[PDB]
């Protein structure tokens, strides 16, 4: 997976170059500006789950306006980014991470919210590809299983530093649990699995999807050609196919079913050996989801998918 890890490093170190570009943003009024941008660049993403589709275009334009140079209403006074080169590079970073935090602390709790957040992330990525590379940067670090790559336990570094690589949320004191960590990882790739299939409707876009559905085929191929982890793999595989299996079936008619009549024969027996009966909850539901789909020859539309009824009311 050298090809993928090189591309992975590019987005990582390239986001690190962004960590260096606005270090000057790290006075009494200069602190007011930093908060005003961090504030007026993360509230809109938090309301995407709680709005009507008829109104959802308001948030898209409000993000597009603030980010394109135009002003936006934050509180009472108006905020802008024009002639604010660090504020521009600062908003793209916090915006890209807020999209991931929402997939981390909302999509984990409520799977339906992935799609209204994905379309908005997909349209902004479309108009501003730099924001999208920052979206992949944070998604990759917070969730390395979305690259995908399984970090290995290494000698010479502390254990706590290794647990963070795995994506475990740790306060300075201790590491987060595993059950709450599996939810954070699920919600993050259900969001990602929704992004690679949905497209912002309005705007009259001539070009291709920013992060197309092609990245969904390789991801499934790239995690099934490596040995599975005990509980993560069987979980993340399910909540990925449930979200993006339908869109992947239509694009690749016969090639997707060949990949699906394979996991039942080859990759499913592999998961039984590595996992004790005490934590089979991932693999057991991975089959319940298929057995229906296999005999039905169809993957249900993800529960929460956006319909036309959503865009009018």
């Amino acid at each position: 997976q050298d090809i993928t890890m090189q591309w992975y490093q590019q987005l990582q170190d390239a986001s690190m170059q962004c960590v260096l570009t606005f270090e000057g943003l790290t006075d009494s009024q200069a602190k007011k500006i930093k908060m005003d941008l961090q504030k007026a660049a993360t509230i809109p993403v938090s309301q995407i789950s709680t709005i009507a589709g008829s109104k959802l275009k308001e948030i898209f334009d409000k993000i597009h306006s603030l980010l394109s140079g135009k002003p936006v209403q934050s509180g009472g006074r108006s905020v802008s980014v024009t002639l604010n080169p660090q504020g521009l590079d600062f908003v793209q970073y916090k915006l890209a991470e807020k999209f991931v935090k929402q997939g981390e602390e909302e999509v984990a709790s409520h799977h339906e919210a992935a799609f209204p957040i994905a379309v908005v992330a997909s349209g902004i990525w479309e108009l501003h590809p730099r924001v999208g590379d920052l979206i992949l940067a944070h998604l990759h670090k917070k969730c390395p299983y979305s690259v995908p790559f399984y970090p290995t336990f290494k000698e010479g570094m502390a254990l706590e530093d290794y647990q963070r690589m795995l994506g475990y949320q740790v306060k300075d004191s201790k590491v987060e649990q595993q059950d709450n960590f599996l939810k954070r990882m699920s919600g993050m790739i259900r969001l990602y699995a929704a992004i690679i299939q949905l497209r912002w409707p309005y705007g009259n876009r001539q070009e291709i999807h920013p992060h197309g559905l092609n990245h969904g085929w390789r991801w499934l191929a790239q995690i099934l050609n490596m040995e599975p982890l005990s509980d993560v793999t069987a979980t993340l595989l399910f909540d990925f196919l449930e979200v993006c299996g339908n869109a992947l079936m239509k694009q690749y008619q016969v090639q997707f079913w060949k990949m699906l009549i394979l996991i039942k024969e080859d990759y499913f027996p592999r998961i039984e050996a590595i996992t004790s009966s005490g934590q089979m909850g991932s693999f057991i539901r991975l089959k319940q989801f298929l057995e229906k789909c296999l005999q039905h020859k169809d993957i249900p539309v993800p529960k929460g998918f956006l319909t036309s009824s959503f865009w009018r009311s």
Binding site: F268, R270, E272, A273
Partner: peptide, 17 residues
């Protein structure tokens, strides 16, 4: 020669190990 033994089998609907 047939001997039915419902007692100890192998779950046909669960993977191994």
């Amino acid at each position: 020669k047939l001997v039915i033994n419902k007692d100890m089998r192998t779950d046909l609907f669960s993977p191994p190990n």
